[PDB]
Design an enzyme around this catalytic site. Sequence first.
Site, PDB file in Angstrom:
ATOM      1  N   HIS A 184      31.629 124.497  32.307  1.00 57.34           N
ATOM      2  CA  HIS A 184      30.278 124.018  32.529  1.00 57.34           C
ATOM      3  C   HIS A 184      28.874 125.126  32.535  1.00 57.34           C
ATOM      4  CE1 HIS A 184      30.493 124.076  36.979  1.00 57.34           C
ATOM      5  NE2 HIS A 184      29.230 124.421  36.804  1.00 57.34           N
ATOM      6  N   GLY A 223      24.595 127.406  41.481  1.00 52.54           N
ATOM      7  CA  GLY A 223      24.332 128.656  41.129  1.00 52.54           C
ATOM      8  C   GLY A 223      25.573 129.665  41.511  1.00 52.54           C
ATOM      9  N   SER A 254      28.528 128.314  40.616  1.00 53.65           N
ATOM     10  CA  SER A 254      29.620 127.763  39.761  1.00 53.65           C
ATOM     11  C   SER A 254      29.951 129.001  38.674  1.00 53.65           C
ATOM     12  CB  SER A 254      28.508 126.880  38.746  1.00 53.65           C
ATOM     13  OG  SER A 254      28.432 125.670  39.525  1.00 53.65           O
ATOM     14  N   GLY A 255      31.282 128.970  38.507  1.00 46.13           N
ATOM     15  CA  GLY A 255      31.846 129.820  37.638  1.00 46.13           C
ATOM     16  C   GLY A 255      32.209 131.031  38.545  1.00 46.13           C
TER      17      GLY A 255
END
Length: 223
Positions: A40, A175, A177-178
Amino acid sequence: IVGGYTCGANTVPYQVSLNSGYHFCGGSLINSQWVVSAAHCYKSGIQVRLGEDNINVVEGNEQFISASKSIVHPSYNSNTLNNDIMLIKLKSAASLNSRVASISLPTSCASAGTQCLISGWGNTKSSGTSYPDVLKCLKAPILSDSSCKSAYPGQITSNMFCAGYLEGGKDSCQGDSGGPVVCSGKLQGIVSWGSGCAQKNKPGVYTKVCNYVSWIKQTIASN
Ligand SMILES: [Ca+2]
């Protein structure tokens, strides 16, 4: 990260920032030329920033390297977030040392109860917005699959796990994320999704990296 602590400069040496003019996602360096992040977080024109602590100040240990190729998992579903994983190849190899280093892929999946380290530059508030400039860290346990499925009925696949605190107050957030979830020195998770941040009975949900090791290794070997 809500309810965490300041990691300290370069204490999480595999943590990357993905930058498209601004920080928008985290990632993990898994060898000198490859980063793993969330699907995403896909966009065109990514610069990978290694060796960061303060993302708004050049402090002297940074390496800025453009992406040459991004590979979203073949079965990523953006509606359910199943298979929320992506590989990014760097245009040139990073220089590895104590402050910039890769994180090992797991050989086995981690069990509920294992303590992990989650890190990122995401929002630090559960209501409102405050984005830190320095890297934040959170220690959190993997939750049982039954607790995870009870918190998110009908939404948890075999490629996801929950980590955090059912009482709320401590979680990853927008923020982050990943970014990495590291347990016993291995990358076990990717920050993926949740209902809000740090809410009671709504722990963070993470991509289960151990299910993807064969795909990661085969993809790196041919690209
Ligand atoms: Ca910096």
